[PDB]
Each structure stands twice: as C-alpha cells, then as structure tokens.
C-alpha cells in the first residue's frame, strides 16, 4: 500500500508555500525532458 | 508544426510495443483426485509386491462466476516413506513387501490448468503469489481380495493439507501438452489414524496409499492466484482505386477559413490519431504501422540522400564531387530554359527546405497534413491496413507543383517546380530579370518562404484590392493573421488560390 | 441560485397554526407503550388532544414498531414531520446509534456487487450500510496487486469479522484500500452510501438513560443536535402528554426537507 | 524561557526551524487483552501497521503495548513514545480508578518521596496531592491540630484513623490543605509520593471505548471538564474500533501535541 | 515562561560577577551517592552513614540532603539504572573483564538518551545517524543480527535459520549496539528476559559523576574509535581502603559539584 490521496494532498499542504521566486523563475526556463524529470525524482 | 509531425515520425523511426506486462487475478476451484497402483505378486494371493502412488490426471468442467470453465488437474506425491509388514515366510500368510505412507517429511504436488486466458500463452511469469485454504484428505476402505481366509481392509487415515509455495510446470500426455501451474502442499497428520483390520497394525498415522480418494469423485479446494506475465499486446496469438475517388469527392466540400485555422496547430501523434474511432487493434498499432511505410518512400529516401550528399560534400573535398555548382561553391542545396530547369531542380530540394524546419511561412506540407487530418476523420473507408501508405501517398502527391521565394534588400526572387521564375520589388510590383547565381547563393543560406500568396495573385490583388505597406510585407512573409483577415474580407483573388491548393490536395 | 435580502424589513407572522394545518405528523412508538397503556382509543384521544394545539385529526399518524432492530430494518419514513421514541439499552447502544445515523442523516445510496467487484471508500462519509434479518459481515483488505493482508482472498475463515447476527450495520473501513467482503446476501442487502446534508425532518427522543448517541464516526466531535432529545420515564402516558404539550418546540426544532 | 516573542498579522512568514529526529513521529497504542482475545489473530499488528502506512506512518513507527487490566496498567505506567493512545473499556464499578488513571497520565506531575514514620505531611494548594502505587494500598489518615494532637483519632491506635483507600492499586488522595495529617500505608507493598500537578501532558489521548463520559479529571467537583484528547466510542466489536481509530488517526494526531517540559519514561517527574 | 520554544538570549560584557551560589545550592539541592557492597563490607559499621552525614554538615550540605544507595554489583546496577536526584555520584570499581560493561554503563548514565520502543517480531530496523543505537537491558540478553540487502534478503545469513545470524552479545545484562547506518537488520533477542530500546544520544547529562576507584582511565564513551575522550565528570582514584576514598570525596565535594551542573531537560 502507498498512501491515501487525502493525506498526499496534506503532504502538499505541508509543502505549501516555500518555493523561492528567483529559483522558481530560473527553474521554469529549462527543457526538463523525460530523462531529467524521471531520473532525479 | 503540421510538418513537425512528419519530422517527428522520422525522428521516432527508430521505434519501428508488441509485448506487455499484464496482471491476471482469477478465482479457481481445484478439484483434484489421488490414484493408487496396487501390484499383486504371484503365488496364491496373500503376498503384495508393492502399493504405491501414481500421477493422477483428472479433466473436468466447472462453473466460475458466470463462466463455464474447462480444467485439468494432475495430482502427485513426493518423499513418501516405505513401510513393510510380514506375517511369515509362507505363501499362505498375508504379507505386504512394501506399502507407501505419508508423513510430515513428504510433499504433495498439484499441476493445475484451465482453458481461460491466463493459461493460453503462459510462458513467462514473475511476482507469483497465491491464496489457498487448507482441507482434509482421508483414506477409504480397500478390501484386500484374498481368495480364501479373512478379509483385511485398510481403513482410516486422515491428513491436513496446508498451502505452500507455488511454481510453474508442464503437464505432458499422449494427446496434449499444457504449460501449467504447480501448486505445492505440505502435510500434517490428523487424529484419525490408518489401520488394516484383522491384522496386527493399528494406531499409526499418515494416509493409506490404497484408497486415498475415499470413494469420492474429487477433492474440492478453492484458491486464488496473482502473477505478472508476458503476452503479445495483440490478444490473438496462441483488396487505392476507390480511395483516391473518395479523396476527390471530399476535396472541395472542405472549407477554407476553418482549414486555415486548423493548419496552424501542432497536431502531434496523439491529436492526429485521437479523433479516429479506431479498432481495438488499430488504436494499439497505428503509429508504427504508418511509420514502417512512411520510411520507405521517395520523400524519406530523398531526405536521406540529401543528407548523404551533404556528408559526402563535406568529406570529399580533396576529391570533391565536381558534378556542378552554380554559385559560390558546392553546397548540395544547389545541385544541377536552362534557368527554368535549374530553378525547378532547386525547388525539388526546397521541398526539403520546407520539411527541414528552415522555412518561415505556411510551409505547404503543413497545409497538406491539415487536409489529411480533415479528410481521414470524415472518410468512412479508414482501416488499420489501409491508412499505411495512404499517409505516404498523401505526403507524396499533395501539391506536386509548389513555389518559393527569398527576400534580399527589398527584392524578392521567386521560383517554382513548374519552371517559372519571377524577380520583383516589394513596394512597387514590377518585374526584373531573374538574377541566377545570386538567387542560389541567397536561397542556400538565407531562410526561404512559400508561395501561398504567389506573385501572380499578389499582383492581381495589388491592382484590384489596393494594398498597404504592412499588409503587403506580412503577405510576403506569409502571415496567417493577415491571410485569415483577407479570407474573412472575402477576397476572390485569394479564395481562388486557396481553392486551387485544395484541388491540388486531391490524392 | 443566489439570494439577496435586507435588515430593514419586518418580521412576518407566526407560521405556526398554518404549518400544522398544511402538514402531517407521524409518531413511531414501541409496542411496550401500547402494552403498558392497554387501551383501544388512546390514538383517538391523542388526536383529539393535538386538535387543541391545532393539528387536525387527519394529520397525525401512529406507526407502531415491535423492536428497534425490526424498525432499523428498512425504515420507510415518508411524512412531513417524523417523531421517534427510542428506548435505552446498553446491549443495543450501537444499534440504536446506527438507527440515528441512518434516519437523522440523508444518504445517497448506490448498490453493491461483492462477488464480482471489490470496493473502497473515498472520503470519510462513503460508508457501507447493510440491512436485513440477520447480517454477518467479514472484510479482507487487499494490496496494490490483489493480495490479502492478514487474510486470504479465498479462505473466508481468515477474514476479519466486524458484524455478527446484526439486523442493521454501518461499516466504515480505512479509506484508500480495496476490500473484499463476505456477507449473507440471502438475508441482508448492502449499499455503498455517501452521507449528504442532515435530514431535518425526523426527531429522535430517547426515553431512558443519558445521551450516548455518537452520530459522527470520527471520535472527536460527538455532537448533540437539536432534534436528538431526552426524557426520563416511569410511565408512557406521561411521555405522550409531554410530547403533545411540547410538540411546537419539536416542530420548531425540525424543518421540512428541501429535496 | 523568560524572554518575549513577537509577531504580526499580515505576514506569510514560512520561515521555521527544520531538523531531524526519530523519523518524524512515533505512536504507541495501549489496548486491552480482551481485544486480542476477541480477535484471535497473530497478524493483526502487522495488518494495522500496513494500514497506518496508507495514512503515512512508516513501518518502524507504530507500536502496541498490551495491558491486562486498568489497574495493572495504572501500576507504574511507563510511557516513552512521541504519541500515546489509550483504549479504555467502560465499567461503572471502576469509574474512580479510570478517572485517577486519567488525572495521572493526562496531567503532568512533579513528585517527591515521602517518609510516613519520621514525618507528618500536609498539602499547600489545591494541586498538591498524594499518589500511591502498588499491588494493594490500604491508606488511613488522621488530621491533626495546632498542638500536635489528633482530631477524631489517636496517634497510637491505628484503628482510630479514618480509612480512604481499601484494596486499591492506584490511589490519588486529596485532603484538607493547611493541616498536618498522620498516615498509615502498607509501605511494604505500595509507595506513596507527594506530587504537584503541572500543565497537562499533550502526548497522551484516552479513548473510552464504551459508555458516556464520566472521567472527572479535575478533583474539584465544580468543573467536570472534558478535554480535546478525551474521546468516546460505541462498540460491539474490536476490529471496527481499530479500523475507526486508523481511519481517524489524523484527528487524534491533530488533537495531540508533542511534549514541552522534557523527555521521560514514567507518568511523573521525580524531584526528591 | 515560554517553554517548548527556543529564543535568542542576549546580554553584555560590563556586568560584574555575582555572589557565590554555593552554601545555598547545597541547601536547596540533594546529593545521592552510589557505593559498592564491598565498601560497607570492609567497613563493618552501622553508623558510617550518619558519620558521613555529620561530615557533609561541616561542608554545608544539611543532614537530610544526602542519600546513599547501595548496589551489589556493577551489572546489577547496569540493570535498569534509575538515577533520580539533583546531584549523583557513582563510585565504580575496575575489572579488566568488565571493562566493556562498565563503559556501556558510563555511556548510558553520563549521557541523556531519547528512547523509543522496539518490536522485533513485526519490523526490521535501520539506523539513520551514528548516535541512534540499540540498548538492551535485562538479566541475560543474547542478541543476534542478520543484515538485509536492497531486496529484503540476508547477507551471509538466512531469514529463517536463526543459527546463521551474527552474534554480538552473549548473556549480557546490559548491551549497547551500533551497526552499519543505512541497512535494515533482522534481530533475535530473548524478549522474555530482556527489553531492547532504540535510543538516540542527545547532549550529555551534567547531573551524574562517575569516579573510577582502581585502574587507569579506559572508558570510551564515544562509540566512534577516534575521540577516546576524557570528560570533566570522569574521575579516577587509586585505592587500598574505602574510608580514605569517602573522606576524599567529602573533602573535595565542592570540586565535584562544580564539575556537575543541574540538568536542562
Ligand atoms: C456536394 O457538396 C455540397 C457541399 O460541398 C453539399 O451541400 C451537397 O449536398 C453535396 N452533394 C450531394 C449529392 O450530397
Ligand atoms: C399578523 O399579526 C397581526 C397581529 O396579530 C395581525 O394584525 C395581522 O393581520 C397578521 N398578519 C396577517 C397577514 O394577517
Ligand atoms: C522569510 O523568508 C522570506 C523569503 O525567503 C522573506 O521575505 C521573509 O522576510 C522571511 N521572514 C522573516 C521574518 O524575515
Ligand atoms: C556579595 O558578597 C559581598 C562580599 O562578600 C557582600 O558584601 C554582598 O552583600 C554580597 N551580596 C549580597 C546580595 O549579599
Ligand atoms: Ca471511511
Ligand atoms: Ca485474519
Ligand atoms: Ca448494528
Ligand atoms: Ca483507585
Ligand atoms: Ca475516627
Ligand atoms: Ca487538597
Ligand atoms: Ca555489557
Ligand atoms: Ca551507527
Ligand atoms: Ca552467518
């Protein structure tokens, strides 16, 4: 068994807000292709 | 975009899937049966040479949850101990040289098989597990047929079968060979012991090897299994003569404004094969089916040959292929009225400039693919074996003649596969002698544009429907915005050209 | 749709003495009460009494029920105002709480096919309610690849028993795992039901001990609503006279359904 | 800490302490023997672990500490976990016992030993009680007067002492605060401690599996409160109780908060 | 009085050193000694406790602030040591065969461990840091370990045949086990007569004071074989009698209590 999706949403609510803005805007300018997106996770 | 789909087909050519990892979870009713082999020595009939077990096949048909399932079960034993009982050295005393008995140390094997899908092509399995319930198996009453004397009867004996590991096996026979599942069971002796009556043997445990079935028709135990196996994705393993006419009937019924609205969308593989209400097999293998034929055509071969000739023109230079080059020097983008001939020959590679991402405008192959996607969602006659090589005949025979242009310091040089060339100024449309050996040097490296708005209609428009500087620059640049604005302003000098493009997109 | 208003408007007249005339009332009393009373015209008597409060004679109904469990077995409450009288029994605490959880709340119920499908609960209000003469339910959770956890999908003995010989059951299990079930489908029918907004049309009245009903399956609220009332008793005529006299309070605590 | 703290109402701060520990929680259930008796299974602990895994708790975080009886559990309850849940069955003949257990585990106590013979003790405030634990504690108390004599009792005849505990394992005795008492206890089998009640223990949660709320945690009869971490259930089986607890453990965990004073294993601090 | 939180503290460098809290901390605190049975055996006196109390009374410590708590043996003391006082002293005899146990005792009492429980029948446990150890108490603990690989299979051991497990303890009353941090271990333990607890070593306990009576200092508190430190409250003496030792302790009880410091937790 993996999770209850309600509790996984609560894990998101634990990762609510704390993304930096310079870092987010620099992260959203990358071609995060399949390899990069499913390797590091 | 609509040519990017062709470029993507070419890119994913290496994929030209078939297998799959499927999960099966089904209930089953294991109705098995034992079998004994009673061998009787010669003499009078008081002496028994052996009483052993035998592999016991049983084939039957039972009712699942709304299914009528045919099945086949093969029982066997392993590690049974051998006991003996001698009453004397005479032919007239009841003696059993050897009889087999069951205890903890032994094991019971059961090969199980059905006619369902889980067993049709089971050759590879992993993550195998199973939930089985325990039962009790007891021996009956085997009366030793003594010609004369008393009647010894082997009676009693019970054992509790507890589940154990599962594996694979193969049931062989003189008729059929079945790739089956091997259910293994461990044993624990029960309270009722086995005993032969009118004989000095009693209060001993196990299961008698004489009549283990107890006169029953089978021993029924339910179970469930789960696995992950390999299976062909196609779940079955264990006649253009009229198509062209359908295309030419569907050609002009299609509209123009909405078609131009649709010819700007990157209708990638999903979007191109989603609106097709395909068959269960086509939806699984459509893309690879069309690709294995798309990389067989004049288009693909010409692309690969241009690439081979560019490689060979970069390498050969010391022995440089001197076939011909008008312009600066050999490029293989310009390889050859003489002027009209050269221009047509260069335009038969400007089609490759088009489907090489080195264009700026409506990129005629894009219009061709839009017509394709607008026709193959309407045409009733579309099928898995049918779309392959229709996509290619489309890509090959849509807009055979097509023109291009290049701009340099406000001077447009046109060209066409139909042997026509036109030089002219942007602001003031007036022809000029066509500057060959400069048009080539420019079209080679500078970007090219397509002739959707070609000079003839352009001049007719600049004459009748007087045109502004920005509108004319955008029409030279082949802008879909101004194109659709004219198409909504209902300009027949553009509607006619678009209708001509449709009628050339005929197949 | 949206609704506007204002605070400058005035309060309207009392809808009482008209809601009585254009509504119906339905009492649900136990056979014990009729027994202790031992009279044939007590219904006519109570209706003539209600007629003083304003409820006309052809508006009040009395619907006897032999036992709380027999009542919990498919209670067909179809009236514009329902009152229930409920005895207290420690041995029947969970049953008389499930009855409340069933009638006080309005349930959106779908059927269930155990033998053919396996089900799971999505939110905290998607429960499994079984009704019948004698229910005996057992549950086996499963994992991602349809294998049992402390149970066997085939061996019914290895299942976990949650109900035994219960006429009504309300089962909440862990929300996010697929369960297999074993139920006496012959004698009990089971539905998967999501709890909608409460039923403001029924009023439970506990005739005996302290307030024990815990509607909320979550053991943190334990709320006591407006239409879950209590009385201490030594006779039944006193209870019925109390109900009669304070019916207006009960009908102010209740509100006609919206559906 | 004495220093102050500041704040605001517009900000969205997001800046907070981050660190590591044992793996982000632990949980310990205290269930009666009767539950496993009714269940009659030897895989139900692992079943509940894999269930909790859906709610987020990893493998090595959930624990069960079976207890035979409420009194046996009251005898030296050693709680060392980051979250504690206590299922407790209802018995009208044990109300005082399972209210003393509640007042003991829910609240935080600071205890000093006591020497009955050599000294005579007294209470100062309404929170300085005398808790006695053991196997059979029979207590008797004689108040005294200003001149070190007795009041309705005699310093010599223990029979004249007034009895307050008979055949109890845990006793929590509150007497008149401001007078010297003389005590007689079965010191061989029980130990008595002068304890003072402090701020509550937010790490435990009681769950009355049965009847209505009766626990009067506050010895004064005027409050009769009921805390957030004092739950009730109606039960006919134990599997359904445990499934309920598991489906609603996030509310239990939102109602419980880790300790503040310190780490400790017993139900009270010792300060001599 | 903000408990449960940690705030920046502040001060200055112009404030003068305040008065001596000595002669008041002795009065409002308590001192508990832990001596061995051999001491009272050699002594053979019934009033030695009242004697040492009247001696402390000269140093300032009042009569009923001092406590003596005997223990027959270092192992019987290691079996669930319950040190609940405001200043604890522990006189410890040296035995080269008991070195490891009396070092585990030191690492257990000198420090303040945050201890969570453990259940071997269900789970398989792994360590996260170098201070998350497993301490086993009881009368005779026989602990065996089988590490597992990435795919839940043993390494040189089988998950059924307990005989193939690796033995680290053999009939020990106290054990403190550290293993490779990052790998799950399956355990065999005599749960009936021993309790194992997974504990994290937090900052030290400044409330106890070990005083070795005999041999050279050997106690390696820190499990890592790089520090081998000698803490401030780790004292040594050389002995031939016990009265001299107690007189030394009493005469230098102020240095001892200066080396100790009332707890934080
Ligand atoms: C021919 O096409 C037009 C539109 O393109 C359509 O309206 C007409 O019905 C078609 N003819 C027949 C016979 O269907
Ligand atoms: C409301 O009550 C007042 C006073 O009793 C009465 O005058 C009025 O007529 C009532 N409203 C209606 C609509 O009759
Ligand atoms: C918290 O972090 C954000 C961004 O990192 C910052 O703007 C904010 O000032 C921080 N909070 C405080 C109290 O400084
Ligand atoms: C601190 O010591 C000095 C010198 O001994 C003394 O004068 C002073 O009074 C002491 N402080 C207090 C508060 O008594
Ligand atoms: Ca639920
Ligand atoms: Ca089970
Ligand atoms: Ca029920
Ligand atoms: Ca008590
Ligand atoms: Ca008296
Ligand atoms: Ca008091
Ligand atoms: Ca040791
Ligand atoms: Ca370590
Ligand atoms: Ca080994």
- What is the pairing mode between strands B194-196 and B201-204? antiparallel
Residues 6+ away with beta carbon under 8 Å from B474:
B481, B482
Rounded CA-CA distance C176/B71 in Å is: 36
A residues 12-31 closer than 8 Å to D (CB): 16-18
D15 Cβ below 6 A of ligand 3: yes
Closest by Cβ to E117, choosing from D17, D81, D271:
D81
SS3 assignment, position D59: helix
Query: E156 C-alpha to center of ligand 13: Å?
Result: 5
D abuts A (3+ Cβ pairs < 8 Å): yes
Which residues of chain B make contact with C158, given a CB cutoff of 8 A? 133
Q: List, in sequence order, every residue forming a beta bridge with B416; answer none if it has no partner.
A: B403
Residue E202: closest C-alpha in chain D = D21
Annotated binding site of C: 39, 121, 150, 158, 160, 172-173, 175, 245
Picking from E148, E110, E104, the residue whose alpha carbon sits closest to that of residue E126 is E148
Contacts of C154 in chain B (CB under 8 A): 27, 131-133, 222-224
Distance CA B58, CA D1 (A): 82
Which tokens hold the place of E17?
A: 């050193």
Residues of E in contact with D270 (CB under 8 A): 84
Resolution, given in Å to one decimal, reads 4.3
Strand ranges for B139-234 from DSSP E? 141-143, 153-156, 158-172, 177-189, 194-196, 201-204, 219-230
Q: Whose atoms come closest to the Cα of E179: which ligand?
A: 12
Partner chains of B (3+ C-beta pairs under 8 Å): C
Retrieve residue B24's tokens.
Answer: 């099966």
Tell me the shortest Cα–Cα distance from A24 to chain D, in angstroms.
16
**Angle of helix B338-354 relative to helix B298-315, nearest 10 degrees?**
100
Cβ contact B359:B253 at 8 Å: no
Could you give the CA distance from residue B451 to residue B467 in angstroms, rounded to a whole number?
A: 18
CA distance D115 to chain E (A): 12
Q: In whole angstroms, how large is the CA radius of gyration of chain C?
A: 22
Angstrom distance (rounded) from CA B448 to CA B444: 9
Interface residues from chain C to D (CB-CB < 8 Å): 90, 93-94, 97, 124, 141, 143, 149-151, 160-164, 166, 171-177, 210-212, 214, 217-220, 222
Sign of CA dihedral D174, D175, D177, D183: negative
Torsion angle, CA of C59/C62/C63/C67, rounded to 10 degrees? Answer: 150
Q: Write the burial class of residue B433 (CB in 10 Å: 0-12 exposed, 13-18 middle, 19+ buried).
A: exposed
Q: How far apart are CA E3 and CA B285, in angstroms?
A: 67
Structure tokens at B324: 């011909």
Q: Which atom of ligand 3 is nearest to the CA of D15?
A: 1
Q: What angle do CA E213, E219, E222 make, to 5 degrees?
A: 150
Tally Cβ neighbours within 10 Å of residue C50. Answer: 19
Neighbours of B2 (CB within 10 A): 25
Q: How far is the CA of D6 from the centre of ligand 3 (A)?
A: 15
A2 touches chain C (CB under 8 A): yes
Helix and strand numbers (H, E) in chain D are: 6, 13
Does residue D12 line the site of ligand 3, with CB under 6 A?
no
How far, in Å, CA of B193 to CA of B203, rounded?
A: 6
CA distance E251 to E265: 30
Q: Which position has the token pair 């061989």?
A: D188
The neighbour count for residue B270, using CB atoms within 10 Å, is 8
Residues in binding site of E for Ca(2+): 45, 127, 156, 164, 166, 178-179, 181, 251
Q: At what angle do helices B4-11 and B287-294 cross, to 10 degrees?
A: 90
The SS3 assignment for E215 reads coil
The DSSP line for B72-91 is EEEEEEES-EEEEE---SST
Q: Which strand (E) or helix (H) includes residue C226? A: none
3-state secondary structure of C115: coil
Query: Three-state SS for E90?
Result: strand
- Scanning every residue of chain A, which has its alpha carbon at the shortest distance from the alpha carbon of C144? A1
CA of D152 to the centre of ligand 9 (A): 5
SS3 call for B214: coil
Q: Which of B151, B184, B157 is nearest to B74 (CA)?
A: B184
Using the CB atoms, write b or e for B233-266: b if 16+ within 10 Å. Answer: eeeeeeeeeebeebbeebbeebebeebbebbbee
Compute the Cα dihedral for C236, C241, C244, C247 and give only its sign. Answer: negative
D8 lines ligand 3 (CB under 6 A): no
C-beta neighbour count of C142 within 10 angstroms: 20
* Beta-sheet pairing, E31-34 with E88-92: parallel
Q: How far apart are CA E140 and CA E138, in angstroms?
A: 6
Measured CA to CA, the distance from residue B362 to residue B479 in angstroms comes to 8
The shortest C-alpha distance from D226 to chain C (Å) reads 11
> What residue of C is the nearest CA neighbor of A4?
C176
- Count of CB pairs separated by less than 8 Å, D with E: 67
Question: In the PDB record, what is the listed experimental method?
Answer: cryo-EM
Contact B369, B3 (CB under 8 A): yes
Mention every residue, 6+ apart, whose C-beta is less than 8 A from residue B5: B266, B267, B268, B269, B272, B369
Ligand nearest to the CA of D141: 9
Non-local (6+) Cβ contacts of B215 within 8 A are B140
CA B352, B357, B359, B360: dihedral to nearest 10 degrees?
A: 160
Best CA proximity match to B246, nearest among B368, B376, B364: B376
β-bridge mates for residue B62, sequence order: B69
Q: What values do phi and psi take at B127, rounded to 5?
A: 50, 40
CA D15 to chain centre: 36
Residue at token pair 């106290």: E174
Residues shown for chain D: 272
Nearest CA to ligand 3 atom 12: D13
**Surrounding residues of ion ligand 9, Cβ less than 5 A:** D 152
d(C-alpha C127, C-alpha C102), whole Å: 11
Q: Is D3 in the pocket of ligand 3 (CB under 6 A)?
A: no
């Amino acid at each position: 068994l993996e999770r209850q999706l309600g509790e996984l949403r609560e894990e998101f609510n634990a990762l609510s807000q704390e993304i930096a803005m310079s870092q987010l805007i620099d992260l959203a300018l990358l071609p995060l292709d399949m390899f990069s997106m499913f390797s590091g996770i | 975009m609509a040519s990017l789909i062709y470029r993507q087909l070419l890119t994913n050519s290496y994929t030209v899937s078939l297998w799959k990892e499927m999960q099966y979870n089904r209930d089953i009713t294991i109705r098995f049966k034992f079998a004994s082999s009673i061998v009787k020595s010669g003499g009078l009939g008081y002496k028994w040479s052996e009483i052993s077990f035998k592999p016991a096949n049983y084939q039957y048909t039972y009712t699942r949850d709304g299914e009528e399932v045919t099945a086949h079960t093969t029982c066997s034993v392993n590690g049974m101990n051998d006991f003996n009982f001698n009453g004397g050295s005479l032919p007239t005393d009841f003696v059993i040289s050897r009889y087999e008995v069951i205890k903890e140390n032994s094991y019971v094997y059961v090969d199980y098989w059905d006619d369902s899908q889980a067993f049709r092509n089971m050759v590879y399995v992993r993550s195998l597990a199973a939930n089985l319930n325990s039962v009790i198996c007891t021996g009956g009453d085997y009366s030793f047929a003594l010609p004369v004397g008393q009647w010894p009867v082997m009676t009693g004996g019970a054992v509790s079968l507890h589940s154990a590991g599962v594996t694979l096996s193969t049931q062989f026979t003189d008729f059929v060979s079945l790739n089956s599942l091997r259910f293994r069971f461990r044993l624990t002796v029960e309270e009722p012991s086995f005993s032969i009556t009118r004989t000095r043997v009693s209060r001993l445990y196990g299961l008698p090897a004489a009549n283990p079935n107890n006169g029953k028709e089978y021993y029924e135990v339910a179970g469930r299994f789960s696995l992950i196996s390999l299976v062909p994705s196609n779940d079955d393993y264990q006649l253009l003569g009229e198509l062209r006419e359908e295309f030419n009937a569907l050609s002009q019924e299609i509209a123009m404004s909405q078609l131009i609205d649709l010819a700007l969308l990157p209708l990638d593989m999903f979007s191109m094969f989603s609106g097709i209400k395909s068959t269960i097999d086509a939806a699984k293998s459509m893309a690879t089916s069309v690709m294995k034929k798309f990389k067989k055509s004049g288009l693909a071969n010409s692309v690969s040959t241009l690439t081979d000739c560019l490689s060979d023109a970069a390498s050969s230079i010391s022995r440089g292929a001197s076939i011909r080059s008008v312009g600066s020097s050999a490029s293989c983008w310009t390889d050859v009225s003489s002027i009209s001939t050269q221009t047509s020959t260069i335009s038969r590679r400007l089609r490759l400039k088009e489907m090489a991402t080195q264009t700026e405008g409506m990129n005629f192959d894009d219009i061709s693919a839009a017509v394709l996607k607008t026709k193959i969602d309407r045409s009733t006659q579309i099928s898995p074996n049918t779309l392959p090589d229709i996509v290619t005949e489309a890509s090959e025979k849509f807009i055979p003649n097509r023109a291009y242009r290049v701009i340099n310091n406000d001077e447009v040089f046109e060209a066409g596969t139909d042997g026509r060339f036109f030089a002219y100024r942007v602001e003031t449309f007036d022809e000029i002698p066509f500057d060959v050996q400069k048009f080539a040097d420019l079209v080679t490296d500078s970007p090219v544009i397509s002739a959707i708005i070609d000079f003839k209609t352009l001049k007719n428009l600049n004459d009748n429907y007087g045109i502004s500087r920005q509108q004319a620059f955008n029409l030279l640049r082949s802008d879909p915005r101004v194109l659709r604005e004219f198409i909504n302003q209902d300009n027949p000098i553009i509607r006619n050209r678009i209708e001509q493009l449709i009628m050339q997109c005929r197949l | 749709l949206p609704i506007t208003g204002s605070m400058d408007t005035a309060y309207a007249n009392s809808t009482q003495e008209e809601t009585f005339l254009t509504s119906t009332l339905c009492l649900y009393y136990p056979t014990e009460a009729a027994t202790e009373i031992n009279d044939n015209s007590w219904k006519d008597t109570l209706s003539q009494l209600f007629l003083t409060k304003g409820w006309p004679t052809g508006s009040v109904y009395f619907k006897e029920y032999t036992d709380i469990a027999s009542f919990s077995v498919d209670p067909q409450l179809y009236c514009d105002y329902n009152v229930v009288l409920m005895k207290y029994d420690a041995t029947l605490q969970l049953d008389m709480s499930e009855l409340a959880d069933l009638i006080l709340n309005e349930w959106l119920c779908n059927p269930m096919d155990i033998t053919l499908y396996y089900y799971q609960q999505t939110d905290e209000a998607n429960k499994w309610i079984s009704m019948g003469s004698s229910c005996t339910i057992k549950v086996c959770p499963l994992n991602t690849q349809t294998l049992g956890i402390g149970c066997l999908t085939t061996d019914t003995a290895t299942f976990e028993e949650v109900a035994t010989a219960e006429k009504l059951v309300i089962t909440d299990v862990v929300d996010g795992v697929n369960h297999k079930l074993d139920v006496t489908t012959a004698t009990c029918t089971i539905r998967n039901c999501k709890k909608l907004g409460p039923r403001e049309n029924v009023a439970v009245i506990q005739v005996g001990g302290s307030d024990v009903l815990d509607i909320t399956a979550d053991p943190t609220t334990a709320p006591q609503t407006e239409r879950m009332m209590r009385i201490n008793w030594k006779k039944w005529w006193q209870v019925f006279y109390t109900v009669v006299d304070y019916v207006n309070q009960i009908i102010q605590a209740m509100s006609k359904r919206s559906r």
